[PDB]
């Protein structure tokens with residue numbers, strides 16, 4: 001039922017780039033691009049919260065062909081134009097430095113993708129992943145804890161839940177639960193999909209809450225830069241209260257490192273009711289209600 005490995009790296013789908021648009025506004029840190037690919041002429045289907053592989057061209061330092069890199073799908077199953085013809089990615093150019101040795105090093109696949117031109121052919125594999133799936137239940141609650149490109153699966157959920165065209169195309173999923181995105185990025189210009197996220201919150205103030213942790217613009221109560229873990233601490237009791245609902249799912253996505261602080265905050269909240277968060281969490285994970293994809 002869930003589409004998986006319709007294309008594999010030995011015989012990838014050759015998609016065509018339709019558009020490659022910047023998500024980091026002036027004054028932001030780094031480069032994150034929204035890249036849409038044409039899937040017509042193949043049968044790649046996918047659902048929300050899945051990933052695809054991109055095989056970049058070229059060889060590594062050892063002369064070996066480059067392997068795929070996985071990217072969380074950033075579009076719903078219908079694609080951004082709700083036509084079932086495309087797939088989108090949210091790709092950060094990886095960069096870091098020296099010495100070490102450099103200075104700046106640019107990641108192979110992410111640079112390729114971030115600079116890719118419309119009309120270019122791309123090797124796509126997948127889809128993959130069954131750990132970040134959105135429940136069919138329209139009354140589920142969905143907590144979304146995202147940093148940077150970790151917004152990607154969250155966009156697939158929120159678009160499916162809240163886009164007019166999605167609602168029109170998905171008679172079986174008219175979302176009436178509560179969704180809460182806590183989104184950590186370093187600056188306001190770095191708030192990926194800011195305008196649309198804020199449009200959703202304005203249109204659905206009872207069904208979507210949007211909370212930001214903007215490290216360069218906000219301080220936590222300890223005077224440190226504000227990170228997602230700080231907003232989770234700040235709202236730990238509320239989040240815990242929501243988590244206790246049998247229908248609540250939580251999704252965490254982003255670069256590795258945010259889980260520890262999130263657990264500490266929820267651990268303290270749950271301990272107040274004599275619950276050991278780490279055990280309760282094990283049970284949530286087993287039930288498929290605790291979804292993590294960090295990289």
Ligand SMILES: Cc1cc2nc3c(=O)[nH]c(=O)nc-3n(C[C@H](O)[C@H](O)[C@H](O)COP(=O)(O)OP(=O)(O)OC[C@H]3O[C@@H](n4cnc5c(N)ncnc54)[C@H](O)[C@@H]3O)c2cc1C
Nearest residue numbers: 069070071072090091092094096107108109110149152295
């Ligand atoms: C399930 C999944 C979903 C993902 N979703 C997304 C997504 O939606 N958007 C996105 O942009 N990426 C996503 N990623 C990451 C993506 O797959 C690539 O790993 C990333 O784009 C960098 O790949 P690259 O080919 O550009 O870098 P590569 O050329 O592969 O270089 C990566 C190497 O950089 C080295 N390195 C050294 N120092 C550092 C440092 N300080 N910081 C980082 N690396 C360092 C490490 O050796 C690392 O292996 C996801 C990964 C997974 C597994």
